[PDB]
Amino acid sequence: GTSVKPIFSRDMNEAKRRVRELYRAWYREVPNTVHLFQLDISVKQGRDKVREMFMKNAHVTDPRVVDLLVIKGKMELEETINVWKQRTHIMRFFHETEAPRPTDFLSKFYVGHDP
Amino acid sequence: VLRLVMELSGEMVRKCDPHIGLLHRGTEKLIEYKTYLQALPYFDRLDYVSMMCNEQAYSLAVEKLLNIQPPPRAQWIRVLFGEITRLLNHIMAVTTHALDIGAMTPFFWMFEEREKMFEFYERVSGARMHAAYIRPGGVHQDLPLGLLDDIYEFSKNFSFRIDELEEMLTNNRIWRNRTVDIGVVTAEDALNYGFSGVMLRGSGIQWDLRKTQPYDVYDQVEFDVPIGSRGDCYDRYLCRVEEMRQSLRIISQCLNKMPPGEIKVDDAKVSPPKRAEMKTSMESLIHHFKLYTEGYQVPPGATYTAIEAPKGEFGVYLVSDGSSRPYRCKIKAPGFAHLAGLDKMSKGHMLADVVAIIGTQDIVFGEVDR
Amino acid sequence: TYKFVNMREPSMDMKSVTDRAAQTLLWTELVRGLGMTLSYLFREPATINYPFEKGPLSPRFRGEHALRRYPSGEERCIACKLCEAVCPAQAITIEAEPRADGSRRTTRYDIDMTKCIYCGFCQEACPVDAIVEGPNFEFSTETHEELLYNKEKLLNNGDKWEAEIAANIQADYLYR
Amino acid sequence: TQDTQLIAVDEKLDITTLTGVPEEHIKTRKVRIFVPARNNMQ
Amino acid sequence: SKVKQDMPPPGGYGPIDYKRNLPRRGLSGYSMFAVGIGTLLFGYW
Amino acid sequence: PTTKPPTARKYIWTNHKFNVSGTPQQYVPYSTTRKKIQEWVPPSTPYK
Amino acid sequence: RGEYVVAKLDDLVNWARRSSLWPMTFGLACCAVEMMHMAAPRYDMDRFGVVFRASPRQSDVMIVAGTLTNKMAPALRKVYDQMPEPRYVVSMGSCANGGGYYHYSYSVVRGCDRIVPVDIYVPGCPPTAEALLYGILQLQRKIKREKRLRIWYRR
Amino acid sequence: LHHALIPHGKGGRSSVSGIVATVFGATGFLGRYVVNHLGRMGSQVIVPYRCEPYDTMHLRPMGDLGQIIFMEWNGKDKDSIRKVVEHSNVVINLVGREWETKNFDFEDVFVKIPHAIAQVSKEAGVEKLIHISHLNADIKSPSRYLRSKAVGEKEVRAAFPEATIIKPSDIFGREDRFLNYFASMRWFGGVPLISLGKETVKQPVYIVDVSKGIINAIKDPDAKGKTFAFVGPNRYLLFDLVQYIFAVAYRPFLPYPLPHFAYRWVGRLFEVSPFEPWTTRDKVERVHMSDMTLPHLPGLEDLGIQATPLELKAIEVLRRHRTYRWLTSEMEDVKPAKTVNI
Amino acid sequence: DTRPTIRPRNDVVHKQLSAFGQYVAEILPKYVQQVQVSCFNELEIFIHPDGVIPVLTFLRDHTNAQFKSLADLTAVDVPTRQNRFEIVYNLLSLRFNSQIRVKTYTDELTPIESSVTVYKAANWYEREIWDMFGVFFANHPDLRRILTGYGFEGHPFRKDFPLSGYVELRYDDEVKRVVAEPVELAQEFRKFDLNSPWEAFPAYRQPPE
Amino acid sequence: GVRTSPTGEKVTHTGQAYDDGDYRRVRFSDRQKEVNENFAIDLIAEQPVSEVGSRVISCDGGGGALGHPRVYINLDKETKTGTCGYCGLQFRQPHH
Amino acid sequence: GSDRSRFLEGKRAVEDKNIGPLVKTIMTRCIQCTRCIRFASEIAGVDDLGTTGRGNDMQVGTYIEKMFMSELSGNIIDICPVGALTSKPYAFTARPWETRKTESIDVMDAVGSNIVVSTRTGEVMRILPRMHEDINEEWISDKTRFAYDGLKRQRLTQPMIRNEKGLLTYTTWEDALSRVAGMLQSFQGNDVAAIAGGLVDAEALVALKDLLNRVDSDSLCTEEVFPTAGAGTDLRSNYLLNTTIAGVEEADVILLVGTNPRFEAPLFNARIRKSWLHNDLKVALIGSPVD
Numbered sequence A: 001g002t003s004v005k006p007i008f009s010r011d012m013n014e015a016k017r018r019v020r021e022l023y024r025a026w027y028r029e030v031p032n033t034v035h036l037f038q039l040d041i042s043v044k045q046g047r048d049k050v051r052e053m054f055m056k057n058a059h060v061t062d063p064r065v066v067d068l069l070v071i072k073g074k075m076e077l078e079e080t081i082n083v084w085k086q087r088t089h090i091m092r093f094f095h096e097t098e099a100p101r102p103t104d105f106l107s108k109f110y111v112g113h114d115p
Numbered sequence B: 001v002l003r004l005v006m007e008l009s010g011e012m013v014r015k016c017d018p019h020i021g022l023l024h025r026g027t028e029k030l031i032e033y034k035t036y037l038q039a040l041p042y043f044d045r046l047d048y049v050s051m052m053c054n055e056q057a058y059s060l061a062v063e064k065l066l067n068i069q070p071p072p073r074a075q076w077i078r079v080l081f082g083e084i085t086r087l088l089n090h091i092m093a094v095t096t097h098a099l100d101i102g103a104m105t106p107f108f109w110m111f112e113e114r115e116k117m118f119e120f121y122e123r124v125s126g127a128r129m130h131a132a133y134i135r136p137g138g139v140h141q142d143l144p145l146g147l148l149d150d151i152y153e154f155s156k157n158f159s160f161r162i163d164e165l166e167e168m169l170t171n172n173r174i175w176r177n178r179t180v181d182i183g184v185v186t187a188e189d190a191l192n193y194g195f196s197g198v199m200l201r202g203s204g205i206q207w208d209l210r211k212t213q214p215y216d217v218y219d220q221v222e223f224d225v226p227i228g229s230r231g232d233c234y235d236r237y238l239c240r241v242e243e244m245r246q247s248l249r250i251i252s253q254c255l256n257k258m259p260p261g262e263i264k265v266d267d268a269k270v271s272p273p274k275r276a277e278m279k280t281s282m283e284s285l286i287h288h289f290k291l292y293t294e295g296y297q298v299p300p301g302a303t304y305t306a307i308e309a310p311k312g313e314f315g316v317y318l319v320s321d322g323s324s325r326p327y328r329c330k331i332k333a334p335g336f337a338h339l340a341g342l343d344k345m346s347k348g349h350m351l352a353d354v355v356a357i358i359g360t361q362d363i364v365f366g367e368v369d370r
Numbered sequence C: 001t002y003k004f005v006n007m008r009e010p011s012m013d014m015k016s017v018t019d020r021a022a023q024t025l026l027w028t029e030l031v032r033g034l035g036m037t038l039s040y041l042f043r044e045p046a047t048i049n050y051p052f053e054k055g056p057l058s059p060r061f062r063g064e065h066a067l068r069r070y071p072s073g074e075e076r077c078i079a080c081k082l083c084e085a086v087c088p089a090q091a092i093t094i095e096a097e098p099r100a101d102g103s104r105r106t107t108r109y110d111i112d113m114t115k116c117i118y119c120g121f122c123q124e125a126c127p128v129d130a131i132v133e134g135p136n137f138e139f140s141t142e143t144h145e146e147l148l149y150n151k152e153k154l155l156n157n158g159d160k161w162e163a164e165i166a167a168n169i170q171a172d173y174l175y176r
Numbered sequence D: 001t002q003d004t005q006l007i008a009v010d011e012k013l014d015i016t017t018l019t020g021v022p023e024e025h026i027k028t029r030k031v032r033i034f035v036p037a038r039n040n041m042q
Numbered sequence E: 001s002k003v004k005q006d007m008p009p010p011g012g013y014g015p016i017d018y019k020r021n022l023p024r025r026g027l028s029g030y031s032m033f034a035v036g037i038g039t040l041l042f043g044y045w
Numbered sequence F: 001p002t003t004k005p006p007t008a009r010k011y012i013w014t015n016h017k018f019n020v021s022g023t024p025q026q027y028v029p030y031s032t033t034r035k036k037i038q039e040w041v042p043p044s045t046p047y048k
Numbered sequence G: 001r002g003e004y005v006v007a008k009l010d011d012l013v014n015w016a017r018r019s020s021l022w023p024m025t026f027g028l029a030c031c032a033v034e035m036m037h038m039a040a041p042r043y044d045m046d047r048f049g050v051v052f053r054a055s056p057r058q059s060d061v062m063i064v065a066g067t068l069t070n071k072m073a074p075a076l077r078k079v080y081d082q083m084p085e086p087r088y089v090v091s092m093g094s095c096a097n098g099g100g101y102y103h104y105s106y107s108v109v110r111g112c113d114r115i116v117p118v119d120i121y122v123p124g125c126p127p128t129a130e131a132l133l134y135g136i137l138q139l140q141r142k143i144k145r146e147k148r149l150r151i152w153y154r155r
Numbered sequence H: 001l002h003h004a005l006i007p008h009g010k011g012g013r014s015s016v017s018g019i020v021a022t023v024f025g026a027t028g029f030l031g032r033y034v035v036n037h038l039g040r041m042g043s044q045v046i047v048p049y050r051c052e053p054y055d056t057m058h059l060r061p062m063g064d065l066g067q068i069i070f071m072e073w074n075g076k077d078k079d080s081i082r083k084v085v086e087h088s089n090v091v092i093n094l095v096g097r098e099w100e101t102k103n104f105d106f107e108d109v110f111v112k113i114p115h116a117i118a119q120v121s122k123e124a125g126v127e128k129l130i131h132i133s134h135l136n137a138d139i140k141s142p143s144r145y146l147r148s149k150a151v152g153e154k155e156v157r158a159a160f161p162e163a164t165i166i167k168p169s170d171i172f173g174r175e176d177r178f179l180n181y182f183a184s185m186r187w188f189g190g191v192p193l194i195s196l197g198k199e200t201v202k203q204p205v206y207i208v209d210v211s212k213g214i215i216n217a218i219k220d221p222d223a224k225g226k227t228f229a230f231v232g233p234n235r236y237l238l239f240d241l242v243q244y245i246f247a248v249a250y251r252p253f254l255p256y257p258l259p260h261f262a263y264r265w266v267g268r269l270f271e272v273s274p275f276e277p278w279t280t281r282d283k284v285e286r287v288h289m290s291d292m293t294l295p296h297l298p299g300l301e302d303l304g305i306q307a308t309p310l311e312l313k314a315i316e317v318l319r320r321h322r323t324y325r326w327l328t329s330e331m332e333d334v335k336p337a338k339t340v341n342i
Numbered sequence I: 001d002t003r004p005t006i007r008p009r010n011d012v013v014h015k016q017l018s019a020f021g022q023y024v025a026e027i028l029p030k031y032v033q034q035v036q037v038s039c040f041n042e043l044e045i046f047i048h049p050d051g052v053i054p055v056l057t058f059l060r061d062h063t064n065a066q067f068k069s070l071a072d073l074t075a076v077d078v079p080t081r082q083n084r085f086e087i088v089y090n091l092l093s094l095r096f097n098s099q100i101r102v103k104t105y106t107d108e109l110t111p112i113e114s115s116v117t118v119y120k121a122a123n124w125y126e127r128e129i130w131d132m133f134g135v136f137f138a139n140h141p142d143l144r145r146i147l148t149g150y151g152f153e154g155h156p157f158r159k160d161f162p163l164s165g166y167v168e169l170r171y172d173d174e175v176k177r178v179v180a181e182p183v184e185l186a187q188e189f190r191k192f193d194l195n196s197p198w199e200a201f202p203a204y205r206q207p208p209e
Numbered sequence J: 001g002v003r004t005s006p007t008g009e010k011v012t013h014t015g016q017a018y019d020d021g022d023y024r025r026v027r028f029s030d031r032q033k034e035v036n037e038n039f040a041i042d043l044i045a046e047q048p049v050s051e052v053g054s055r056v057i058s059c060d061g062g063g064g065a066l067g068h069p070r071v072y073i074n075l076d077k078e079t080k081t082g083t084c085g086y087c088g089l090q091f092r093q094p095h096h
Numbered sequence K: 001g002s003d004r005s006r007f008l009e010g011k012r013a014v015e016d017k018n019i020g021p022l023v024k025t026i027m028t029r030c031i032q033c034t035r036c037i038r039f040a041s042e043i044a045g046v047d048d049l050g051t052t053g054r055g056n057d058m059q060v061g062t063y064i065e066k067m068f069m070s071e072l073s074g075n076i077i078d079i080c081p082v083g084a085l086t087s088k089p090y091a092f093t094a095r096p097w098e099t100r101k102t103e104s105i106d107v108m109d110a111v112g113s114n115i116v117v118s119t120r121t122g123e124v125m126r127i128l129p130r131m132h133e134d135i136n137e138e139w140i141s142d143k144t145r146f147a148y149d150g151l152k153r154q155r156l157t158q159p160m161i162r163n164e165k166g167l168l169t170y171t172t173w174e175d176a177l178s179r180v181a182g183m184l185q186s187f188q189g190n191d192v193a194a195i196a197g198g199l200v201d202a203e204a205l206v207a208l209k210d211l212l213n214r215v216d217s218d219s220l221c222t223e224e225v226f227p228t229a230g231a232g233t234d235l236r237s238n239y240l241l242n243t244t245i246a247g248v249e250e251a252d253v254i255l256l257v258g259t260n261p262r263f264e265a266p267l268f269n270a271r272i273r274k275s276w277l278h279n280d281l282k283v284a285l286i287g288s289p290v291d
């Protein structure tokens, strides 16, 4: 039933261990990417943007899924340091252009007839 | 569109990373939402060098699932245009290579010739390229009167046009030193890297789809493929040039004994009824009506059947859901297998000659990126 | 059957090495290239004098569309809707509601040129040869909006490229 | 029967965060599983 | 009835060249060097 | 078109235009269909 | 006259801007065939003063040819910015100008004009070689319909 | 409202937003951004253009196909304005010359056209007008800028009773004509700053803030009549301003004062050129006077927008002016400036 | 051919690959769940996820198979089955001019040990499947995005990612770069519900449920 | 046959007419509206009505294969003279 | 079916007919399957369709000109296997391969007929009947089908207020909700009431009930009247058709009191039609005699 094959994790411990130095690699990644890619957003801005993206993937409770997020997570940092990505790619997570989607009931009610 | 990112140990290169994807259109994804007839021009847009040959692969593939064979006449036209694409492709292949090196004149003599067969495509289908001529069941329209004579006149003069392409490149010591002893691929590495077509032919390996598993009507025709000794970019260049000479005879053999008969299979459930038949026969209207709304329903199954496209082993792997629409058609391309070994291919050589390796690899960003 | 290409076994005799040494020392294959190119120079070119003359085409040529009409002027289109049922790029949009004389013919026939593929499936799909691929191709415009065709634009081109299209379809209906 | 550092998770399988769908397209959606109703004409 | 589809002539189309026709134009290696040296001696004289 | 002209019909254009792009007689795209729904017209009664 | 001198100078300034403009490519897809298949002897363009040349710093008009994927979108924008002024872009092919076949797919922007300010649109899938040659001719005629020095003098 | 004008769509490019703008003279610094902030949610912008079409090329991308309809117009041709604002729900006036030209003196550019377009638009039954004027519109200022700015302001306010006059302080941005001006002194003698610039503690506004402010003014129902006053987030003095920008741009800073009438000759020399006058004796007075504080007029934050800081979103233009020396240098390297923030 | 409409069928090829299917079945019956010949004379091998390396190595070096030409590797993602991703290889043998299809099954989470040891051709036939579908192959040299935009999310060729995707590009003046945004279509891709309500083939009829 | 709108916009056969308040009419200003003057609605009002005589007429559309899929039209409703749906050509019986 | 015809003779042609502004008759397409006749005289209960003549030129028509009156006439469209009988309003408006079908219900009648809504380009073209047996079964009454154009008639699409003179002028939401809010917080109890309409959603009914109660008021009236006295709405069986029309066939004698179901609940009568035809129901109604 619950028998599934691993890729990198058995227990949440080592699963949370992988996201630890994944943060560590990403934590030290911010100071170089902002300067080398010539942005405008601040260093701590990037650091918290890395931070928050962790919190989005926090409600999952399966060692089986987190590592899939880890490999997806580790599938991006090298794309930044080795100048593979571009300014439109790494500032994209800095969601800037789009207008702010209304959150309260009235403002959604006013904008359109959609949920 | 090529994003080659690669390392310079001084002037010497140790690993080349060809970041393909710059032209990636998810062709198979759109194919999932079109009928077989609608999905056909996608293959026509896959290898926009030897376009009609891509129709050949898709056609016999759908013929194989449908258990319907093309009429004998239509079989012979397809190989005529199939080899014209071979003439189309190798002319582009040798010259773009020569264009990459720095040879300009071979590019324009051969590209002067390219108009003649593009003009032939105009007379037979109605477009310079992307003919959409070869369809499941044979070919859409019949050959216009006098076209066979016209291609005969072009073919009877084309062997002359090859000579200069050979004369000032094959003998030119400049072309040799800029094309020999580069992109050398050993036989087993070529085979096990998934390479197809000329890389197999160039590296000494005796193998060709058109002869080992002769599809269509290639049975009756007779010729000889040019397997060489070394397999470097120069050797493949002779294989390319000799293939145009070989394609000339293949054109000759189908030309002189073109059989009489229909252009499309006499199966209205798979081939649209004739326009004259459309406006007189009640079944013709019904069959034509539904064929252009949903099309023929293909029985379930899956095939990969491939043809010897001038790029190499080109095949399509479609799965049928038992309806009038494909489920998934993996676009197997020689170029993706061709380029898969680029890391080794540029190994041991510098920039100015691995660009020659790019030329001999016959990479075109419609087969890989789709 | 197959034939080799590279292998040559160049003979190492005194006469043969002289030719190879002469070829290297006093270049001969290179001067061959000069001779071939010069022979190319003394040959009249193949260039065409556009627009004063334009290259050949075929009766089957597929170009800018046009909605044709009967001998008396009736729209051939009946909104059977086969054309967009086979339009590979879904460039055709059609709506039909009643026409004054009891009829319920079409109102909307917009083939987006920037979506169309010019495959010619529409003209083959049409059972009344209403939509056709015209011979014209010189309709380049500087606005994206111009290429977005409508019903009136299609009908006007049908009245513009009419005699030519009628002759082509008369010279091609036996093939189709 | 088989074991290679076997993983045993009781949590209901959920890709969600890995399939890449956006939040408003995972929370504010409605999916009605049913059998297609045949067209009464046919 | 009658059928007038495109067809080859009532025999066959004329035979078409299929091999390489690279010609051999020039003098022997001895002749090339001899005329070159002969000019040099002429020029020196 | 000499020798034998093509066929003659009423609806063929009396003269062939040129490419009208970039000129005041350009082509403009517009919706050829009719407005599907119509609003509820409010009566202008004096009131109440 | 004051208007006459600026009229003669304006013509001289742009008389050969429509005859010495040199095309630039990116050559994405099957439209990249007619890109230089026109450079082939048949539909000679070198005679028209135009001649293909990449040299993004030293070219006049770029003929955007092929399908514009999102992945390449930075590359075109950086090329057009590096493009010197005056600059024009020509959208060859249905895919380039309006997406064409793949308009509904996920990895192509629907038309090039969504990315670059797009001049004369030449349609075709692909545009048969002379159709762009006609399109290039329209671009040169558009160059004549310019009042650069006239507008400056009016201000 | 009109059936076609009702807004639909999830605020997208093809979403009918109802706004039908007619931004006048949008081929300018603010026009590009406001059009972008107009075409982003699908507003049918009918921009009148008077220059070469090529100069309007950069405006086509910021909008769905067929949304940005370019039309020609003339200041002296009344029919030109009447056409452009004919089928216009809203009118946005932005025309203004920052220098003096022969065909248009400074009187008309803020009296003739702004009054004429406001009058005809009311005569054409438009529903709004957002004509803008500098916060320092001052008929008492000897500079012909601020005189004509408020001289004609009464006409547009009167002829259009509900005219939402806009009063921005200092619109700094990419092509702001001030930040780029201050670096141009590198080839005009080392920083000739009058009185070492001790006169202009100022609050400049970023373009996104003001341009966003405009698009709210169209959709904000209260915008009618009430004149808003767009301000910065932070008061900064010239010697503080120029030192800061010369520090972020890393250009050598050598401020140097001189008599005011010397700049009158400097202004005169730059205006004499038969082309774009690099320096006008008008604007030096404008930069000389500080940010006049008008507290009665509602500010930027009233509409519902926070004013982005100067030091934050400024590197964009300063980076362009850096030489190869410290071009790649980042933003936090530089020291922020002395915030007086009155 | 007395029936030129139909495709003529061959039986000497039919039984021979049928016999070879048994041959491979006996040699290693640990992984082959079942073998299916085709009317198209394309015999197919159905293997287990752990069986990828054994069979692929077996057909590579065996003296009676010699299948060493990797044709393609792809997925046939089928939502209705618990193993949605159906990984299938195609092999070609020059010596005996035959084509072998080996088919596996996998969930979104289960991995497959990389076949780069068998064929280095898979090196790039592995990357796109991880990108296009999302299934991850273990012990592979690199799992990079090869056929998508940089930073692209999800997996397109799945039966979950819509045709138009979720994100659209456009060049914006304020940022001076081509930025992204949620997709918006001028035209919605219309639906063509074209599957007939009449049964097509009695032969391939699904067994009653 | 074409009728002119109050604003001068020539209406098409479908009946489309941009009113005064339709803001999108600005697309038409400084340009020209494209109307096919030949109005296919009224090109059959004047077309002669065939007096071919039989209970059923084979209407092929003229030009043989260049017309429309030929249909059989029944002439038994003397009130309504038969019209080919494809063609619109008008056929009547010689008073039965 | 074949792929061609050996037919080289002529085809018979028959004139059209006019039996309704909804059904459209192209009777040359008729295949004489007699489905309409058996439907008319067994399901709709009207004995007017028939096949006049014999041989091969016979027509499935009505001989004497007729005006098809049955309220189940719309289902005659969905039973004919050819285009011989077709819906006039939907004719030449859409084709099947583009109409996205959504399964929904009917609100015209108090049966909640399971229907298929054809949608294309933000609008509905034609309404089809679904299947659930107890509900509409395989047929729907006419006004259930030919009602899509009603959604294209007078439509309330914007908020409304009385302007300075009163005249109904279109306004934003803010003024509309502000106007109601001012008079909503004021007044209490029986001052604030509610009258339920015909086509009111259960979601809205709850919302009004909660809203009226949160301002301490219970006056949520309804259009039709049902005596509250005795038990009223308290007992569920008072206001329910507890017999589950799918069970009417099981019954033997039907007693209909003060109703005209052929005009009020056509499908409920259609069940009796089917049930009484096969199960031999004994019907008895007091009131005005209507067919």
Ligand SMILES: NC(=O)C1=CN([C@@H]2O[C@H](COP(=O)(O)OP(=O)(O)OC[C@H]3O[C@@H](n4cnc5c(N)ncnc54)[C@H](OP(=O)(O)O)[C@@H]3O)[C@@H](O)[C@H]2O)C=CC1
Pocket: H024, H025, H026, H027, H028, H029, H030, H031, H050, H051, H074, H075, H094, H095, H096, H097, H098, H104, H109, H132, H133, H134, H135, H167, H168, H169, H170, H171
């Ligand atoms: N700190 C500041 O400087 C502030 C300035 N403002 C106001 O902003 C306005 C300018 O903004 P912006 O548009 O970005 O400035 P730009 O100088 O960048 O552009 C000015 C525009 O005005 C047009 N124009 C000028 N004169 C005429 C004329 N006679 N006929 C037609 N068009 C004309 C120009 O046309 P063309 O491009 O062909 O020259 C151009 O489109 C001025 O009114 C200014 O006072 C508001 C707040 C603060």
Ligand code: SF4
Pocket: C076, C077, C078, C079, C080, C081, C082, C083, C084, C094, C125, C126, C127, C128, C129, C130, C131
């Ligand atoms: S053009 Fe032809 S196929 Fe298309 S709707 Fe009109 S009649 Fe039907």
Ligand code: SF4
Pocket: C083, C086, C087, C088, C089, C090, C091, C092, C111, C115, C116, C117, C118, C119, C120, C121, C122, C123
């Ligand atoms: S030619 Fe164009 S309009 Fe016609 S079917 Fe092909 S893509 Fe559609």
Ligand code: SF4
Pocket: B045, G029, G030, G031, G065, G066, G067, G092, G093, G094, G095, G096, G099, G100, G101, G124, G125, G126, G127
């Ligand atoms: S327009 Fe046609 S030829 Fe050009 S890139 Fe698109 S599909 Fe290819």
Ligand code: SF4
Pocket: K029, K030, K031, K032, K033, K034, K035, K036, K037, K060, K079, K080, K081, K082, K084, K085
């Ligand atoms: S249901 Fe239709 S086809 Fe059948 S008899 Fe009646 S009219 Fe004829």
Ligand code: SF4
Pocket: B286, K029, K081, K082, K083, K084
């Ligand atoms: S769709 Fe059916 S009913 Fe209509 S004409 Fe064709 S075959 Fe006859």
Ligand SMILES: [K+]
Pocket: D041, K077, K078, K079, K080, K081, K082, K083, K084, K085, K086
């Ligand atoms: K029917």
Ligand SMILES: [Zn+2]
Pocket: J059, J060, J061, J068, J071, J084, J085, J086, J087, J088, J089
């Ligand atoms: Zn007819």
